[model samples]
Target chain A: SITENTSWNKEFSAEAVNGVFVLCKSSSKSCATNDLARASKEYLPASTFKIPNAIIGLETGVIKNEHQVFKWDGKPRAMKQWERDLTLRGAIQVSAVPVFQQIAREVGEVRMQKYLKKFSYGNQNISGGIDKFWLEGQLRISAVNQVEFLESLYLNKLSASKENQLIVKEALVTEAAPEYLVHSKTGWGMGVTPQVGWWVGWVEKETEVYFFAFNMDIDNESKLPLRKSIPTKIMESEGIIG
Target chain B: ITENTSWNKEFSAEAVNGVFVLCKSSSKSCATNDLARASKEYLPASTFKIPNAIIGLETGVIKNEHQVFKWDGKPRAMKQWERDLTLRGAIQVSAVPVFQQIAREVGEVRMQKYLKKFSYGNQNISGGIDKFWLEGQLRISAVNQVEFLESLYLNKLSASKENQLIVKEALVTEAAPEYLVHSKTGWGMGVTPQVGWWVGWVEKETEVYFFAFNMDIDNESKLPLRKSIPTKIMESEGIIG
Candidate 1:
């Protein structure tokens, strides 16, 4: 579990309305702090659960590879970007909910529950329905728990095969620079009040890796950028990235 | 001066004991951390001299601002700092022994009564007259220090207006292009976790701002941070340009 402290919160004095949680891999242990103690409390995993869903799909042969594409039905969607067919990589990049929902159906409720239990993901409850369990379902995980899951994936310690884990990791890559590779995912719990926003990821350096998870209550779509910027700012301040 | 608000003090870390800055503009007041800590008493250390100077002059314990105290010729840390000096000179140099002599002349009873009227700290001067404000029983909080300085600046304290003006004049140490700054720095070595302070205000054509910052100093290197941190924060807040 992550410990609490006010040091990290002081960095956001100008934006006091939001609560932030940050965890960094130290030499021998993980260091964490935030404005609130609820970093360990469960909230909907939202789209961030896609990381594990991708891994399970690939391991269970539901998603053969990144090139395996799900053809989009003719039905119109909320986002223009989500209105077309998408491969595993493309679905994650655009956060196409329908494409992943199809993939989740193919993976089946039984197999999904089995994999989630194996990963010890959240409370391992998918009862919220196969298509939207992670959206407003019973599935929930805290920021601290998010870091724990990501650290296992980074270390290839999950029940998923190494190849599947690496494949899922490849799909999650958001930025690649000469000195580091950033694998991340963004999540938004839209159905709730004080909507939750998240940016969960890991930074890969030549000698070490740093995993982090950040979430906050966002007032509107304009504040959504804070999910990424807040974690990025913390990473830069900690010298984990430039 | 900046306005005072309960929210101003909420931004500081727990490590910062107290921060009180009152700009002439009431909208500019900022207090952070423990409000109780602002009122909780601690030995005034050298800060007591701001009031001490006024009492000495008002009581005729010192004839005038230029009245000099001869050096004892004993070797000291700042060997050349405080040789023979006037009241103004002693204040600028923070000559401890010179203030001690003046306190001795002012006597314990008069000093006690004056402290009571000023409502300085807890107003307990039982700690020997000369040593009381240093590390003895005499104590004051950052809130009381601001109140004391505010009264002196407004000539509302019991001291004669001229005496108050004279002491305030002696506090003038820096003159920038737009503002004149009167301030004092105090370091208390007798206490655990040690206390460091920078108390004073800036005088501008339009208004005055009183700022008092007190924090625990971990080592000698941190002493410089006491001044730089508050000044930088004040600058960023537009309290000082």
Candidate 2:
């Protein structure tokens, strides 16, 4: 919705990747996005939905605390990082599917549906299945929705407790520096089908928080890196990072 | 005036009375015991080691974190400091001799340059080239300490991000599943009214609380209170549980 960021197309063009980038500042109600059409085109939430899932897990008592370990049942996982016991922070860090899958199962359909409706998640229909709704089912959210959701997350304005929101924010920390903090979540596309890669998060520089939602066509595994690099390049252009 | 009032008890019931300033990142608002005392400037003792190390890394005087300064066969303020140390180790042990040697390497000109750029203290590294922050005339108030720390936290300092990360990791006093606390302890032992200091920031999830505490060190045993007071305060703030 932020029309002035049309120049971000250059970043996408340079990477030769097609995607949508949305950056919003909560306090000012200002935003910048590369493409408005794609920004509004709903896509599978992928693992990016983990942000709210973890929050719901905490708010619903599925997760007791940030340090509460999500036990890794002995089974083959997508990655070796997923094969160990994980706390919410650790699970979020590794994007452990089984851990969150268990969380979704525990949250149950009634609570999950109630929370999604409360969150205003795009097309909040979880018809395909409880655990696979955001993964492969009907739940879909656009870049605009993602950015707005994250803005609410940044402001602790979601229909969740502030402490749980704080816990989720901490769990999202991918970069921590003396000058700033970055809380982000990455989602791999429904690759079974351009695997739409995603990197959505917020950056805290002093009191100003910048929420960003990025997703690109991932035709091959190699193109996945652009989910973060392109946005970071744009963020650097925005003077949010140096 | 929120629920953070419980931390004040730590300062009240101690032999080494001091002021504690806890600045929440969520809001720039700070909760402190005595605004006047928190604003009062005092010499920055071993706490100088933090910036000294940062300057050492950025100025190329100390090379990298792996560069070792071999311990000279000489007496020092403490036995722990008399051995060879990495930049991280020196910071950990508060190696005055190691940092003094590093400061000497950083010299007056570059030291002044970096401190001015860093907005550290009053940018007065006078008194003695290497001893200014320790036994010299350099002084920084708690508010100033927290401000400088926020800049460091955000990497807004006029230093390389890598060097800042290195120094920040070295500043880590506690690491847990839920939180991280990066801090530096300073003890100004040779002044009219000796002041002890404990300064650093707490990273609990996404929130940050930058704190600076300095108390009159009437007894050496009270040195423990330097970190204890701030630690107990943070505990009350629900920053760590």
Candidate 3:
């Protein structure tokens, strides 16, 4: 009861405003509430959904690694010019949409759903493809659920083998900040409305295991800046050696 | 759009009353739903919460796996009974009161808050440790949530290492009738005038995965036997062998 009340007060007190926080710990003494946070429902994962798209490409033998060539020959794409020529790693780091969309097509919706479900994305409900709900074409992932997805990946739960897991793991941005080995992806749905931003990663300290998923929803105009700032604040406050 | 439209129609059409459903296969799928079902949120009602208590005993180094205690007398003290039990086996059978009191003493409040931050057990703003919320506590482990939690356990996500995992593969309930036997069942709290039942399991097939959770509330006068039938029937009909 004290644990529940403290966390609720800390996260939802008048100071928190509209933000939602989801956390997971690798501690046995911990309870379910300790391992999962939020309304515990579901939400569009935004840029974070890209992690699976990138992984599917690598596993299907489509892209060799982050460096594999994925050209965007001046076609009308979702992001700017620099964002279009992104490697799998850059796509995730920059939260590129066009590159992910291209990769998704190569992987195919049917194949995409197969891998998405395998990664436990969209909570294994990748019907009508990953884009069915939030992104209009990409799958949506919630904060609490997003952490589980990342954990599954980090543990090689979905990969065919350890080798495959390593290859894919290497192709992604392993760390957003230097201190934490962060394997992350960001998502932003199409539209002029508030875009959703996600940053998920794990910090393995000698003392404890930490996994975090931050899903930020803000108007497109201020999305990127807010996305950039919030994660920094979170990492700093947590004493994550950024 | 078509798929969601169809899914939405099912909800509005009275065919389904759930928020989320996860089908873990291509052709054969087991679906879990988290609808309006209400129960204490991870009240540690039964087997589900035992793993933590078991681990705490071992982790705190207060008890070892091989430590032994027998039913020395009648009206056994919960703590003594728990102390006598093996950490792994104690959780498999779902020992309550012992765990409830243990967690409370060990770190119940802290653990509860940690889980709330992670949004476990539906971290409602108004949700607190209610002694008279729904069946008892203010928590809900709907069908889908049950499957979700069990999936975490089956995947061994709780503990840092394989050995550290509290629930072992062998100790789980054998898959019944239609699927693999990994399960932790529960029945706790009460409705307006009845108790609630929560049963969940994960069915692992050669090339498929199935997760199912069912929660129902019935009057105290009536047995849960009636409400419980639909869950089994649905799982039987919807899943492929």
The prediction achieving the highest lDDT against the true structure is: 2
Candidate 1 residue lDDT tens string, B85-151 = 6565667667788888889999988998898899888898776878877767777777778877778
True contacts kept of each: 0.00, 0.02, 0.00
Ranking 2 against 3 by DockQ, winner: 2
For residues A2-99, write the lDDT of model 2, one tens digit per residue: 66567778888876888998888754257777787898888888889889899999999998875576665687888876777766776777777888
Residues B91-146, candidate 2, lDDT per residue (tens digit)? 77777887877888889999999888877878888788878887788888888888
Tell me the tens digit of each residue's lDDT in model 1 across A108-137: 999999998888888888987898999877
The weakest ten consecutive residues by lDDT in model 3 chain B span B1-10
**Interface RMSD, prediction 1:** 32.1
Error of model 1, residue B40, in angstroms: 85
Model 1 reaches what TM-score against the true structure? 0.49
TM-score of chain A of each: 0.93, 0.94, 0.75
lDDT of 3 by residue, A1-242 (tens): 10232343343233333444454565222322322444354666655666666677777876774335455587675445343454444455555566666666677767866776566666555545543433554345666666676666666677544444544454443432212334445555544144555556665432245566665555555445544455545555667535
Off by over 4 Å in 3: A1-17, A27-39, A81-84, A123-134, A174-179, A190-195, A206-208, A227-235, B1-241
Compared with the true structure, all predictions reach lDDT values of 0.73, 0.78, 0.46
Which 10-residue window in model 1 chain A sums to the lowest lDDT? A26-35
